[PDB]
Write a protein that binds this ligand. Structure first.
Ligand code: SAH
Ligand code: SAH
Lengths: 4, 334, 334
């Protein structure tokens, strides 16, 4: 779900 | 953890997919395509690199991925470019892209993490360090820690680090759409409020994970932006960010602060890369790859969560607690 | 496994969340709130129940959750209601809601899976069996399996099962927004084509996971809807659905079939519960809790994926392969  | 071993046997899997790690497939298909199609992110890197790359300058890139940024430095006439990439498959694919662009004599891709990179792997210290390993939280992929490791060991005092500055922000928001899918009261006369005992007012959650794009829904910012911290990638390190900070926020609007919204801005000279929803309105890919982060707000620690309510002009104190590695944080009304 | 055990020491966790399993917190915060605020879904169950619940009727529900549907049966005046909930903490919360609505005399909640439910746990066989355990894929949470097991063991010949019918649909779509975040060409004169090797044209992915709401983006349907299968919950069995089916699809439009879109319809009498985007334009919470599912389409099995391109009036043959439990499927152009 996107970044990290 | 091969993709084909994670799939029911009755379902066909094409050869190109069979043996690649399932986690790689997942990551690539979640954000890599969006990232590569963020034209403004690509333009940011190109324009900053254009100011520093001469035929005499060596370039080291951390985290090659598709090799795009490495290709840019070579396109700009760099003396040499070394890119490192932890994923074995992505490293293969980056070399294929390099050959497809006829820059095989200019760019070397090394399969390893940047921590394993040693001075013997480069012709000499690089004139430019290049990276794009920002998360939805700016430091969410440990960008500063990796840049710091390289900076301590392989660079020289004249090395240009791109990008140079980053700032992480928070702002309390009212957002009915978010509220609608993160809370419940009841249906008609039927009370369901005890489901609220489990409301997650601790975790940082990316807006994408809620299936929401902030630009697309109505939300009110209830104060001026709060600067959580600022970093200079050529001199800061993670311990420069205090484990606990306090912020005094004056309410500029009245309403319920359902959540804290988090976004950031990265700059180098005059150029800016921002994830503020107000800046990404016509950048769908950026919202899909970075988006913004959210944390639901609880006013106290009762058996049920308490809404944080703002009255315009009042001061509200938040305590910001960071994790040890500064990747995760939490904001609590005091 | 407790929430507090996965969180950095420096981040405060309220007592209400501390011991609860991180899987419960995640599921509840991701889907349960949206689910309970799906007002049309609640109305659907109330109106169907209203046709069958009398002061004489006993009601069994599978999957209590917050207790909402069991509370509805009680409100309509059921003689007795038993609900089973597999999560221990959710079971406790349902009991709390039941008390808050003064219905402790009518609704009992048992902590266990429906497969462990035995006739000794009930006053008598129920006149009504009730469940809402549908996924984004209709059968994605094993709805048919759990109902069948109960149907084999605990019911009587005149038991009404709610809801009665379900139909799973698929339709090929062109969607530029989806294409922009699921594929790459390059940036300016830099070719990145080889990243396409990892395009996941196998998995069923929820629209929500792509960060997109089908209602909010432009997409074209390229043929009439395809009925994958239909079920009658009072007589169908898993093996009624073949391990493999073929569908001959006629292109009603010319265009690129970027993906197969999957949605379903559940009915009982005149009442309908649909996840077709057209039917959820004004139902945000449904789109967040169920939404639709997508599968990216590859034409062949070469080193890079090949676009499926539809010419109007022509027909295209798809092989549908289902997993053993029918939870998963895959559409492949032949
Ligand atoms: N410390 C590190 N050393 C080597 N590779 C890293 C790394 N940290 C992250 N990566 C890899 O670097 C990539 C970052 S995302 C790719 C960005 C790339 N500059 C592009 O624009 O295409 C990921 O593929 C990840 O696998
Ligand atoms: N076979 C089964 N036996 C017992 N509980 C089940 C089950 N299958 C799913 N569940 C539980 O049932 C819940 C389904 S969510 C539906 C909740 C409730 N029926 C409502 O309408 O609001 C989940 O909490 C899950 O824990």
């Amino acid at each position: 779900s996107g970044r990290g | 953890d091969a993709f084909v071993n994670r799939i029911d046997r009755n379902i066909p899997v094409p050869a190109r997919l069979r043996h690649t790690p399932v986690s790689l497939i997942e990551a690539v298909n979640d954000f890599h395509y969006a990232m590569m199609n963020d034209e403004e992110r690509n333009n940011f890197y190109y324009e900053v690199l254009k100011k520093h790359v001469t035929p005499e300058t060596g370039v080291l890139e951390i985290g090659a991925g598709s090799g795009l940024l490495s290709l840019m430095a070579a396109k700009l006439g760099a003396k040499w470019v070394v890119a490192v990439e932890g994923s074995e498959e992505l490293a293969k694919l980056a070399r294929e892209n390099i050959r497809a662009n006829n820059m095989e004599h200019q760019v070397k891709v090394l399969h390893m993490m940047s921590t394993e990179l040693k001075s013997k792997h480069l012709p000499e210290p690089p004139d430019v360090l290049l990276s794009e390993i920002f998360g939805t939280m700016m430091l969410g992929e440990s960008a500063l820690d990796y840049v710091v490791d390289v900076r301590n060991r392989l660079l020289k005092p004249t090395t240009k680090i791109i990008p140079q500055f980053g700032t992480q922000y928070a702002v309390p928001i009212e957002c009915d759409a978010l509220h609608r899918i993160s809370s419940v009261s009841g249906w008609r006369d039927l009370d369901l409020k005890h489901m609220m005992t489990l409301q997650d007012t601790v975790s940082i959650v990316f807006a994408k994970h809620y299936g929401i794009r902030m630009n697309s829904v109505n939300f009110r910012r209830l104060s001026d932006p709060i600067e959580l911290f600022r970093v200079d990638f050529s001199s800061s390190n993670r311990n420069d960010i205090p484990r606990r900070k306090h912020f005094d926020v004056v309410a500029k609007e009245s309403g319920t602060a359902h959540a804290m919204l988090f976004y950031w801005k990265v700059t180098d000279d005059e150029f800016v890369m921002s994830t503020d929803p107000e800046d990404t309105v016509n950048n769908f890919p950026r919202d899909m790859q970075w988006g913004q982060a959210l944390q639901l707000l609880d006013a106290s620690n009762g058996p049920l969560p308490t809404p944080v309510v703002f009255t315009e002009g009042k001061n509200y104190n938040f305590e910001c607690n960071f994790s040890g590695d500064r990747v995760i944080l939490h904001m609590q009304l005091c």
